[PDB]
Design a protein around this nucleic acid. Structure first.
Length: 225
RNA sequence: AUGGCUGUCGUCAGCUCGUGUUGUGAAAUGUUGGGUUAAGUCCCGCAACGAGCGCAACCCUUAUCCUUUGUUGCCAGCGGU
């Protein structure tokens, strides 16, 4: 469902940030000054969206491992339901500084995650005492809280969808070095560099993120067939 | 000129590494910060993610109960004193 303007101009995706907070590189994607707040010009959003949608489909058509990034609070579970529905990965909690570039080490910690889920899959934590077992639920729970829906990755992904390029620039900086293409919903408060397939507009509204993630969930599910 | 061995800082809680990242570089980050602890003890957060020597625990003794055994050990309950 590649939206054009209908529910786009109804959820508040045009919006942006204060003229006190705007980043100078967002000059071309601007139209509006409603009460000293920058409004994105949608005329170069939907075409840019569809071109990105096309390339995201190309990756998914060749069985590309798509990895989302919706780390912030008001996107947490939103990205999660919009990820496991399209059988792809996601980064909903704090990004582990040095995840992809430091894959050599995190791979071993994620190996531990599969192992720990094993004793809790059939129930063999009760072999030892309760408090000691309570300890392994603390680690395991925190382990699946951070590296949950990424445990079945197998290596480096190909499609990195990220929300709020300025707040999650760490993921972008790691995806720049590996030549891995990254797709971001760049806010007027963010920076378009680092990301090749930039998409201007808002990323703060809860309704708005469902518009983006909803549309991309479709592109992958059609590229699988 | 040394090995082995010991003292001291001090039984003070600190000392480092692999990988990644930042800086031309020495190095830094991790090991900073908010709390907390006898203790980088623990939690949360964090360009850091894990790991090692350390603190703890495991060790011996002491403090209560229990089982087994009853001599040269023991004396309640019964005889003889």
């Amino acid at each position: 469902a590649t939206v054009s303007m209908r529910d786009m101009l109804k959820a508040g995706v045009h919006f942006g940030h204060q003229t006190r907070y705007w980043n100078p590189k967002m000059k071309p994607f601007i139209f509006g000054a409603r009460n000293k707040v920058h409004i994105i010009n949608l005329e170069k959003t939907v075409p840019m969206f569809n071109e990105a949608l096309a390339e995201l489909n190309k990756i998914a058509s060749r069985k590309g491992k798509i990895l989302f990034v919706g780390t912030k609070r008001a996107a947490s579970e939103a990205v999660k339901d919009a990820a496991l529905s399209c059988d792809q990965f996601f980064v909903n909690h704090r990004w582990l500084g040095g995840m992809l570039t430091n894959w050599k080490t995190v791979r071993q910690s994620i190996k531990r995650l599969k192992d720990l889920e094993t004793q809790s899959q059939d129930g063999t934590f009760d072999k030892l005492t309760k408090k000691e077992a309570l300890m392994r639920t603390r680690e395991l729970e925190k382990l699946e809280n951070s590296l949950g829906g990424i445990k079945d990755m197998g290596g480096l992904p190909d499609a990195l969808f990220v929300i709020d390029a300025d707040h999650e620039h760490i993921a972008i900086k790691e995806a720049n070095n590996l030549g891995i293409p990254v797709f971001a919903i760049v806010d007027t408060n963010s920076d378009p560099d680092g990301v090749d397939f930039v998409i201007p507009g808002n990323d703060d509204a809860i309704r708005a993120v469902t518009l983006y993630l909803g549309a991309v969930a479709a592109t992958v599910r059609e590229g699988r067939s």
